[PDB]
Amino acid sequence: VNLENKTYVIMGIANKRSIAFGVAKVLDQLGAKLVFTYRKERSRKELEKLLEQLNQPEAHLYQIDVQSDEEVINGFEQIGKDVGNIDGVYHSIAFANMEDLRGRFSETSREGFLLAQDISSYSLTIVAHEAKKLMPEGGSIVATTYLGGEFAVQNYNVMGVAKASLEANVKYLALDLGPDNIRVNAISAGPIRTLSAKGVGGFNTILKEIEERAPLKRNVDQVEVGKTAAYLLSDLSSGVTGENIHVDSGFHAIK
Amino acid sequence: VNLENKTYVIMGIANKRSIAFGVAKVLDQLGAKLVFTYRKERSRKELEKLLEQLNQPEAHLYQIDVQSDEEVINGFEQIGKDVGNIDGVYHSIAFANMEDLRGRFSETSREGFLLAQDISSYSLTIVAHEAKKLMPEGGSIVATTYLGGEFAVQNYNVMGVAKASLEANVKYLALDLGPDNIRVNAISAGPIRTLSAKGVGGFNTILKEIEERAPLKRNVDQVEVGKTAAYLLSDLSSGVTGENIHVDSGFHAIK
Amino acid sequence: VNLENKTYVIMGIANKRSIAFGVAKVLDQLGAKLVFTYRKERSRKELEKLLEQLNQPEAHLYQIDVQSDEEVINGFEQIGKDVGNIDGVYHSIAFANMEDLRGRFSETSREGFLLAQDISSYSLTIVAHEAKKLMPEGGSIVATTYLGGEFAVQNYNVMGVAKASLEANVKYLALDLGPDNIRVNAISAGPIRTLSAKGVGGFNTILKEIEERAPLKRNVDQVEVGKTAAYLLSDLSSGVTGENIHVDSGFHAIK
Amino acid sequence: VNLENKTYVIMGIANKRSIAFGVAKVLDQLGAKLVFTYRKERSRKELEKLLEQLNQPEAHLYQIDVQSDEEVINGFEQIGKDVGNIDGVYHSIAFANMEDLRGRFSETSREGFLLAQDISSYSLTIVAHEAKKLMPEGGSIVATTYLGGEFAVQNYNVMGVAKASLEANVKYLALDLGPDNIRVNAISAGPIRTLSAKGVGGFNTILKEIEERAPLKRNVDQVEVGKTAAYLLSDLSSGVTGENIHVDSGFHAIK
Ligand SMILES: NC(=O)c1ccc[n+]([C@@H]2O[C@H](COP(=O)([O-])OP(=O)(O)OC[C@H]3O[C@@H](n4cnc5c(N)ncnc54)[C@H](OP(=O)(O)O)[C@@H]3O)[C@@H](O)[C@H]2O)c1
Ligand SMILES: NC(=O)c1ccc[n+]([C@@H]2O[C@H](COP(=O)([O-])OP(=O)(O)OC[C@H]3O[C@@H](n4cnc5c(N)ncnc54)[C@H](OP(=O)(O)O)[C@@H]3O)[C@@H](O)[C@H]2O)c1
Ligand SMILES: NC(=O)c1ccc[n+]([C@@H]2O[C@H](COP(=O)([O-])OP(=O)(O)OC[C@H]3O[C@@H](n4cnc5c(N)ncnc54)[C@H](OP(=O)(O)O)[C@@H]3O)[C@@H](O)[C@H]2O)c1
Ligand SMILES: NC(=O)c1ccc[n+]([C@@H]2O[C@H](COP(=O)([O-])OP(=O)(O)OC[C@H]3O[C@@H](n4cnc5c(N)ncnc54)[C@H](OP(=O)(O)O)[C@@H]3O)[C@@H](O)[C@H]2O)c1
Ligand SMILES: CCCCCCc1cc(O)c(Oc2ccccc2)cc1F
Ligand SMILES: CCCCCCc1cc(O)c(Oc2ccccc2)cc1F
Ligand SMILES: CCCCCCc1cc(O)c(Oc2ccccc2)cc1F
Ligand SMILES: CCCCCCc1cc(O)c(Oc2ccccc2)cc1F
Numbered sequence A, B, C, D: 001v002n003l004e005n006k007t008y009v010i011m012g013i014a015n016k017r018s019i020a021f022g023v024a025k026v027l028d029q030l031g032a033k034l035v036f037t038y039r040k041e042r043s044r045k046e047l048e049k050l051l052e053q054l055n056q057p058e059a060h061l062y063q064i065d066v067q068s069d070e071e072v073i074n075g076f077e078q079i080g081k082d083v084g085n086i087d088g089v090y091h092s093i094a095f096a097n098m099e100d101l102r103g104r105f106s107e108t109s110r111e112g113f114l115l116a117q118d119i120s121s122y123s124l125t126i127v128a129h130e131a132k133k134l135m136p137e138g139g140s141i142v143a144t145t146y147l148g149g150e151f152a153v154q155n156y157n158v159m160g161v162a163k164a165s166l167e168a169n170v171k172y173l174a175l176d177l178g179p180d181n182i183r184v185n186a187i188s189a190g191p192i193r194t195l196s197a198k199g200v201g202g203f204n205t206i207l208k209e210i211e212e213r214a215p216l217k218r219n220v221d222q223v224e225v226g227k228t229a230a231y232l233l234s235d236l237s238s239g240v241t242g243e244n245i246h247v248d249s250g251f252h253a254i255k
């Protein structure tokens, strides 16, 4: 609902299509001060262009590669100095090598399996640890997952095992951080046409199947994830932790 | 989530401790016009008194015993004649005989088992059928469930089987009514002291074990249910249907 | 396994294609003594001719409509008098009105909803209660379910809610009867061509989708249900109760 | 379930209390030929002493540290030259640093998190890939898991997220290897006093809660896991893949 005098860190905007930019537009439109973290330079320039469409009167941008403890630790330390205590973190970060996102899961390399774990699951653990320091009176942390973490979805392969790892991460952090009044939840988004979606074998087939087979008979967009992000990030969800909310036209519920 | 020019029907207030009155207070605070339904004379009296705390310019109160098709059908028809189209329904209704909330589940009577299914599960299906008539543009329907529908909880017995039935009822309605743009969901509430809670053996023990074991280390209340009802019943949740949101301090996620 | 000296009651053989006759063949091959229950006189006729395929040296056949308490009570009592104590019960019984297995779930009548609960779920509870008397040292009870109890499968409709209720019944019975050393479990069978299948809309379409999509890329048969039954009814599974084993080519595991 | 003329590779015996020695006792009693893999020389020494209680007329022992692709690859290759084609693999391997099994999850180190994933989840993927070479006509692969993979259990911490990973690995392997007639399943064992259990904080208090709260009111042992292993590794479970069978006295089904 209304989020004036709230402050949220959004990680993982790459471009206009990022799920995280959908989150950002909804939080922005609701009055939140926003901070953004990015990995690569291109995502920075992009963010600077995208910020023109938002009502943020100023550009809070931090480079953080979640493969580096130092960058996560220092980035959050700096956010603390620049902006003060924050009210939550939206985590929208995942990665796996393309060669792993097709053909045969049983052929996945150790290096690729461990990389997807590092970036797509462990990153939440360390982000939660550092972000907690900026949440002395509690807060909310939301990560993004896909139904592939709950069932085996053809092609999603190593990323489905990373997402399953992430969803359990979310539950273990909810149990750990709960006494500190920090809630930790996931949004299981339906398929959405993003930069990262280009890397997944058979994406287009899945989008069509949703339209044919999901209860709502349509696909979801980034703003729909954003609205559910706003619920999860706000006092509207005050009793909810350890949860996975599927923003997916009801596909999760059918077989 | 501003709800002005929305109208919701709330089924199942008995007194100020009813979960559904937690829902009312929140929706009322957000500007919803509300319509209430009740079974017992005593519940209408309490409703009349409770309406003084709310901002409803008008008392809209209908007697509906969900054991009666004619009452549900004529109730919602009369609702549409008096207020027009509605945007959703909050179902907060269950019932079982007391001896069926303690002791050995295997001694449950047939009449007892069917009574709990009828009021606590079938009622949602018929309410959805009649309510659909007043939602030509779509809407949202939310029922109230307990974790005993997902796992065997000592003493919850016949009501656990009825809630497992209700939760599937929510999924099958979600699938059936999705093409009509009517979303159907459940809130799985943690234990709250209400009139119905006095019928369940070992209720106090469970309350204490939530405080000691759940991530948030505290129990939830009716208003926290209400806040997640407001998310579910508004456009904030637009891509979400067939879902069970646990408002239970994270207890569902641990073991 | 090895089942000489064991006695099992098998409920719900109607003809040679019944899931329960796949169970009977497997147990009979394993040396078990079998007792059979039936509702229609036609089912008894088929049973008498199917017994010719089996090494049962004695027909023990009992009419039990699980809608009648009297009949479940007297039947199990007579079984006890004729064969002595038993080791477990296979329950293969369900029923819904045909018109409820196609079209719109929201149009389900109260009478068809409760019929399905009564036959397909409540029946297990009273069977368990009566069978218990014949298992002073413990035993095993298995019921047959389908994935539509866990997810909303188009057309399965009222029977999905009755299976959700059955699967919770299994968990509550497991909890209640476990101290008596009676294990209670479910087999979630994949689609199999049976007399009851003839009543479900879109059944052939689902058979095809299983071949195309399930991990094993084929459908299962009654004998494969029987072999998992043998496991569950024997000491091989002594540690397992409240469980739902999917015998379905892995279809449950995928999306 | 006679297993004469079958061959199984059992990975992860360290001593008489290993879960995998439970499996081995059962498979060996059923007439299988068994091949064992180990990491520490001390484990080889215990295996030589334990083999004297088994009926195996020869010791087939191979050193395989699952952190090394070379040792997995050359290990299975050598196994195929010595005993020819096999019927299945029992995977009973996990590891985590002791500090990661008590205290706060959120303080987990990147290196400790990825170590646990590497040994406890990824190992199954590469083992399945190499073992597949020895199962041209199909076979069965079973891994060992814990309820901590499905819910946040206090103290299980980094291993819980490694088990979420493992259980998803099992589903993705099931889907991938299904067309080759290789089944992949998990057993979710209840707590058992083993060498690895000594490293987990609060293990004793959980053992006691199982006796008090689980449906069977008792803990399980390694032979019980072995019996379900024999079901999963044999033709009795032919229609069953991507499944997780809880051998835990029913504790998974209750809250
Ligand atoms: N699109 C879908 O259908 C879908 C569905 C369900 C869930 N999801 C999840 O939604 C989230 C966002 O993905 P998206 O679809 O929005 O695609 P996206 O726009 O490509 O976003 C991926 C983001 O992850 C960031 N990232 C990758 N590795 C990083 C690292 N090591 N450190 C910091 N940032 C890193 C990328 O940053 P750089 O480009 O700056 O490297 C990029 O901003 C992901 O968790 C994804 O798994 C997506
Ligand atoms: N309290 C909890 O810890 C808890 C936790 C999880 C879920 N729930 C669920 O929350 C919902 C509301 O219960 P509550 O705890 O708030 O208790 P409550 O205040 O006692 O409300 C239950 C309501 O059910 C209504 N009802 C029963 N049979 C009915 C019938 N045949 N026709 C119409 N209405 C009928 C009652 O109306 P009358 O008084 O007029 O008869 C009463 O208004 C139920 O679904 C319950 O299972 C409760
Ligand atoms: N076929 C499938 O694809 C499938 C998949 C998953 C689960 N299942 C389940 O498997 C079980 C057996 O069904 P099936 O497929 O084998 O079909 P089936 O051969 O038609 O068997 C159904 C049995 O239910 C019995 N029954 C129905 N109402 C009864 C009553 N009131 N009292 C006593 N018995 C009654 C019938 O007995 P009478 O004929 O004597 O009336 C019949 O023997 C059911 O629980 C079913 O839902 C089936
Ligand atoms: N005990 C329980 O209550 C319980 C419950 C559920 C699941 N589990 C699971 O059961 C499985 C067996 O554990 P357990 O309790 O039987 O304990 P255990 O006797 O200590 O066995 C664990 C085995 O893991 C092997 N291992 C560890 N790292 C390895 C590596 N890098 N390469 C090859 N082997 C490695 C160890 O071999 P070395 O000693 O030679 O290093 C040891 O043989 C594990 O997956 C565990 O998570 C245990
Ligand atoms: C067959 C699967 C069909 C739909 C997949 C839905 C889906 C889920 C994601 O988590 C995702 O983000 C990444 C995916 C891979 C690597 C990095 C990020 C993108 C994406 F489109
Ligand atoms: C061991 C039980 C642990 C706490 C149970 C939580 C709980 C759930 C309900 O669904 C409920 O409403 C009814 C219950 C029974 C009959 C009618 C309504 C009240 C209630 F307190
Ligand atoms: C669209 C779903 C297609 C797959 C259906 C699988 C299936 C499950 C049953 O439980 C069943 O027994 C019934 C007994 C009585 C009434 C209905 C069914 C028969 C049956 F084929
Ligand atoms: C919260 C306490 C709950 C009881 C834990 C049950 C349990 C599960 C295991 O997976 C395990 O094996 C490893 C555990 C850690 C590292 C390596 C192996 C041993 C173990 F006793």
Ligand SMILES: N[C@@H](CCC(=O)O)C(=O)O
Residues within 6 Å of the ligand: B102, B200, B201, B202, B203, B204, B205
């Ligand atoms: N006194 C009742 C209900 C209250 C309680 O259980 O604490 C019982 O023995 O079941």
Ligand SMILES: N[C@@H](CCC(=O)O)C(=O)O
Residues within 6 Å of the ligand: C101, C102, C103, C198, C199, C200, C201, C202, C203, C204
């Ligand atoms: N082929 C389906 C379609 C039935 C229907 O039209 O409902 C059947 O009759 O089993």
Ligand SMILES: N[C@@H](CCC(=O)O)C(=O)O
Residues within 6 Å of the ligand: D102, D103, D200, D201, D202, D203, D204
């Ligand atoms: N091994 C101890 C751990 C004690 C501690 O971590 O302080 C236990 O069983 O709890």
